[PDB]
Symmetry: C2
Subunit: 393 residues, 2 copies
């Protein structure tokens, strides 16, 4: 069987709900993945930050096996030894009274909305009929906006304190939920000064500052929390992805007692949320992150890589911009001139796989254990692949 | 550290969003779990059907380790060898064109709603922004009584309905079994009004009632199947939707986004979990031991003042109490004391769902525990 046998097999037995780059992987180790035909590629997506520690990290796999021999799941009908150990681990490590463990990052966001709204009722006296959470324009009037007839989410521009303050004036806002750097918007970094302002603004209007660190956290930008960079402490933290080194779906919300204690019991979530197996894996995944100093590696190698790449592409007709912080980087192209999807196929050909976002911005997010030498080899691949297209206009 | 230490620890570091029975488990094997103090209990919840195969089943753990050494996740940005093998396995096994893999059962339900609505437009050609879906008691949803063909047909008449989503036996409602005749009628009715018959088999499926699909009992083939829980033997969150091409192709690329859905690690675990289910003939075990256990239990409790009813099919059973007379929660604590753990539902119905590898002898020992527990509450009234 060949890569193609597999790709056809999937098309005929599975739903067509995804549109993958045509490579079929069978193995990962650290910063490399390997296809059906034993070709090797640099993984520059890291399963969207789930394998910050690197593919198939042995320590984590170990933790997983030690737990899975004892107990894999018992459900929230009862207690496990493992979950508490995790909860205590995470809380001490991030400096929050409590933590709530879950599976997917969506579960994290949903639960966060419930949380903010209820805190808004129980504490700030706002009616759930009328509670609003501010978010940002992941991209960029006539509308009932008053009392019970309200949007649920108010969108405002990212990196915009004036606009943010304008909405915070609404007494029915209970929360601003924001990413330390916008992933989906194409890796948009904020001005150093934004988050400091955000923290003040929220403090002042008595509104929960929630930071979505599902992509930006756990080493990706150089720190355990990207928000650590701007010296601000959010009221609520969302964690996920790299929280497990790709060995399990695990995500979390962190908050102090005054926020977390708004949550009433009996309200069902997922059966697998907070299971012993995940709890064990979680602690090891973060222990690996800290012991191997992967945060610092990222911090040290990141700014250079980005700067040097900015240099070597300064004279490209198709490149629009090169952005990043730590090892969370991207290249935005002028989709007027090039087809972003082809650039991704070209990369794949040149030995580095990644994916598009907007059909204009390409994600550059390798596992955090990458070496200076490896990054240099990749800069070569990147400069070369971009050359290919520049050489057609 | 003791059970209590462990519980207090959770209270102070984790959110209080659940309300567990006060037992702290450290280990599972098959039908038994063991607490901090090395006490042993019969697990009669099976993590709500996630461990049909039994706790910590070795074959599955093996499958898990073989895969985890090779690749755990790459995301849907790319392909893995393992996923396709899974997809092909499941499809052949259940008799549907395609399958869509996911993580949680909620993801399955959400995705099912999207699917039904979209089929309802790109096919039944329902007016945009108006596709209603019918569901059973317990904005574009219509509730109707369970086990009610007359009521069901009345709603099916709405030309804007695109789907009926229903459980082969109602779990949350307190283990409610339908009359043999209901589902056959359901299938006809849906066939006639041109409406997707979706079966939620997340709890009822994979051996729990004696068959791979509980609907197999009633000789009906649903347009869509939802699977989960036992789909992994409790080793990972894995769930699925099954459907043929005419329904499934409605879904187009790039509209969704859960990173872990369809990952290679889960894909591998899935195939083994079901292989275990079939090889160890756990469906049949459940089928054979089930009806007896339920009948015999009905007998031994016929004269109880606090028991209201004993229901079940296969090893999916329950006992409903008269919450006027007893506190269901205390009945659960008493069980725990007598060596069998389980949970309440409604504060009136108690779930009896052991792992499917339980033996006739074991069930008998449990019947004893159950009867003993019950008598304690009879006398004391």
């Amino acid at each position: 069987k060949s890569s193609q046998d597999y790709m056809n097999n999937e098309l005929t037995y599975g739903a067509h709900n995804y549109d993958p780059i045509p490579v079929v992987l069978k193995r990962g180790k650290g910063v490399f993945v390997y296809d059906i035909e034993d070709r090797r590629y640099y993984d520059f997506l890291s399963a969207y930050s789930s394998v910050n520690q690197g593919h198939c990290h042995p320590d984590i796999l170990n933790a997983m096996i030690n737990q899975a021999k004892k107990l894999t799941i018992c459900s929230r009908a009862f207690f496990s030894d493992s979950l508490g150990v995790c909860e205590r681990y995470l809380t001490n490590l991030f400096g929050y009274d409590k933590v709530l463990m879950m599976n997917t990052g969506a579960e994290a966001s949903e639960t966060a909305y419930k949380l903010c709204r209820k805190w808004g009722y129980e504490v700030k006296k706002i009616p759930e009929n009328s509670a609003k959470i501010i978010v940002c324009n992941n991209n960029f009037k006539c509308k009932n906006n008053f009392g019970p007839f309200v949007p649920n989410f108010l969108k405002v521009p990212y990196d915009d304190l004036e606009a943010l303050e304008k909405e915070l004036q609404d007494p029915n806002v209970c929360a601003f939920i924001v990413e330390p750097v916008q992933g989906e918007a194409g890796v948009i970094v904020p001005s150093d000064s934004y988050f400091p302002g955000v923290a003040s603004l929220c403090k002042k209007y008595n509104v929960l500052f929630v930071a979505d660190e599902v992509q930006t956290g756990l080493g990706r930008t150089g720190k355990l929390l990207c928000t650590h960079h701007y010296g601000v402490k959010p009221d609520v933290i969302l964690l996920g992805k790299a929280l497990s080194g790709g060995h399990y779906p695990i995500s979390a919300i962190l908050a102090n007692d005054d926020v977390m204690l708004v949550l009433k019991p009996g309200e069902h979530g997922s059966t697998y949320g907070g299971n012993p197996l995940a709890a064990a894996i979680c602690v090891e995944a973060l222990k690996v992150l800290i012991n191997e100093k992967l945060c610092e590696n990222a911090d040290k190698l990141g700014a250079p890589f980005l700067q040097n790449l900015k240099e070597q592409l300064k004279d490209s007709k198709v490149v629009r911009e090169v952005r990043g912080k730590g090892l969370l980087c991207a290249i935005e192209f002028k989709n007027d001139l090039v087809n972003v999807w082809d650039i991704c196929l070209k990369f794949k050909e040149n030995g580095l796989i990644t994916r598009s976002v907007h059909d204009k911005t390409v994600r550059l997010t390798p596992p955090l254990c990458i070496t200076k030498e490896q990054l240099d080899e990749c800069t070569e691949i990147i400069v070369k692949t971009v050359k290919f297209f520049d050489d057609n206009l």
